[PDB]
Design a binder for this molecule. Structure first.
Ligand SMILES: Cc1cc2nc3c(=O)[nH]c(=O)nc-3n(C[C@H](O)[C@H](O)[C@H](O)COP(=O)(O)OP(=O)(O)OC[C@H]3O[C@@H](n4cnc5c(N)ncnc54)[C@H](O)[C@@H]3O)c2cc1C
Ligand SMILES: Nc1ccnc2cc(Cl)ccc12
Length: 437
């Protein structure tokens, strides 16, 4: 099936890989691109798995994997199978194409010989290679010590299969507990909260921070967000640190360090991500000790014929410094950029990528740049506002709270690197006419 040589080899079949394949095909007409994906599915977008797919009117959504966005229905897959060609035919099809080798994992990378070895022993030589391996969900040490019973009833949410299995659980058990206050955990709490209001079931979200998104948003806005999640039918337990997890009367028992105890039927752990850097060993590729991931330069390049994009890429931002970003749009932007550089562009990361979060069709966040609650922040509000994240009197990150269609404005503010004595005048650029942290 897999040919012996391919011009463009993309390792990983996710968002960054697909954006690169499209970019390569657009920049190099007739290009022959092979995606190798350990997952059995073709490249698909993940944001819907914690959002639109749960708010669908169609009860066959679990099968169709179609969702309504404003309002137009679409598939979770980036392209239908008709868009792709088979790997075996990729060398011979006139004017080339894009092929996906599913159910196959690259286990060895030989940088000197421009070659990889798959889990089945097959070997593929390449001319240009992209590493777009993404990451694997983290787990809690308390769950790793809890035993097989607890582990079998704990979900690490990332893939289509995780959505299908958790959606079935939401219709079978009476209580689900989400561990993690980040965007994924909070989105899933709002999604399961909607499903639980109709079924009369329970949804719990606990995390160590004082409020939802506490590591991202300032405290005043994190607390406002916590109240909104609570009003979606969720029992939110802030300031909760898990000490142990066990099984009691057939139910899961979560013991917190502060003495509280939570009984539940199923657990969903949304506690971050680890970059998939296993190939750095055989490949002799540098890993970044500070941010994790493959260390690459501003052009996303690691070695002469190897680039890295997406969640796994720790890159140099010429304006904001060395970073590693784990956002959907960043995978598209960095994958597209890598693709262009794999066809001779030599372009640095320049167009900043944005990210967003929806806590239902009511609350919506957009953000861009260096967004960290540790940085000093200035928030101008009017249920609506903009949060400026500062560094040396220069806005380095922006959060748009219920403000839409103004990302190009935020992108220009950060690019300009200007200093501002009255950020209230900058807030007017977002149609905002007070809080510090
Ligand atoms: C449920 C969910 C909701 C999200 N919602 C949002 C959102 O609303 N907004 C936002 O900005 N971001 C969101 N994100 C983040 C965004 O989806 C990720 O940043 C994006 O998917 C990263 O793209 P990627 O190509 O780098 O990695 P991935 O999408 O993880 O793709 C990597 C693929 O490569 C495979 N792979 C790994 N190693 C190998 C190997 N050795 N050989 C072969 N294949 C391999 C992995 O199995 C995976 O299939 C969400 C993520 C999840 C999971
Ligand atoms: N709404 C989001 C914004 C950014 N990053 C996210 C990562 C995950 Cl895993 C889930 C949701 C996200």
């Amino acid at each position: 099936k897999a040919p012996s040589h391919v011009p463009f080899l993309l390792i990983g079949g996710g968002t960054a890989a697909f954006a690169a394949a499209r970019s390569i095909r657009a920049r190099d007409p007739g290009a022959r691109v092979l995606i190798v994906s350990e997952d059995p599915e073709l490249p698909y977008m993940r944001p819907p798995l914690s959002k639109e797919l749960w708010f669908s009117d169609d009860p066959n959504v679990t099968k169709t994997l179609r969702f309504k966005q404003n309002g137009k229905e679409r598939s979770i897959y980036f392209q239908p199978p008709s868009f792709y060609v088979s790997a075996q035919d990729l060398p011979h099809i006139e004017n080339g194409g894009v092929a996906v080798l599913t159910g196959k994992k690259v286990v060895q990378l030989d940088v000197r010989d421009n070659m990889v070895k798959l889990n089945d022993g097959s070997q593929i030589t390449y001319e240009k290679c992209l590493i777009a391996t993404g990451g694997t969900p983290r787990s809690l040490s308390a769950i790793d010590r809890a035993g097989a019973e607890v582990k079998s009833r704990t979900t690490l949410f990332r893939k289509i299969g995780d959505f299908r299995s958790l959606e079935k659980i939401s219709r079978e058990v009476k209580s689900i507990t989400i561990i993690g206050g980040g965007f994924l955990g909070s989105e899933l709490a709002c999604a399961l909260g909607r499903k639980a209001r109709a079924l009369g079931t329970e949804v719990i979200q606990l995390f160590p921070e004082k409020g939802n998104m506490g590591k991202i948003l300032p405290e005043y806005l994190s607390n406002w967000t916590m109240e909104k999640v609570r009003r979606e039918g969720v029992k939110v337990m802030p300031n909760a640190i898990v000490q142990s997890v066990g099984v009691s009367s057939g139910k899961l028992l979560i013991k917190l360090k502060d003495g509280r105890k939570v009984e539940t039927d199923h657990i969903v752990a949304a506690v971050g991500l680890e970059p998939n850097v296993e190939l750095a060993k055989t490949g002799g590729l540098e890993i970044d000790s500070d941010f994790g991931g493959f260390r690459v330069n501003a052009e996303l390049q690691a070695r002469s014929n190897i680039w890295v994009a997406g969640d796994a890429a720790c890159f140099y931002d010429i304006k904001l410094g060395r970073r590693r970003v784990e956002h959907h749009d960043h995978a598209v932007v960095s994958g597209r950029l890598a693709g262009e550089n794999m066809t001779g562009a030599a372009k640095p990361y320049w167009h900043q990528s944005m990210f967003w979060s929806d806590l239902g069709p009511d609350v919506g966040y957009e953000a861009i740049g260096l967004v960290d609650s540790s940085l000093p922040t200035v928030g101008v509000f009017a249920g609506k506002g903009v949060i400026f994240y500062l560094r040396d009197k220069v806005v380095v990150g922006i959060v748009l709270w219920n403000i839409f269609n103004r990302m190009p404005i935020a992108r220009k503010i950060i690019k300009d690197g200007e200093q501002h004595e009255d950020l209230n005048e900058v807030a007017k650029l977002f149609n905002i006419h007070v809080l510090f942290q």
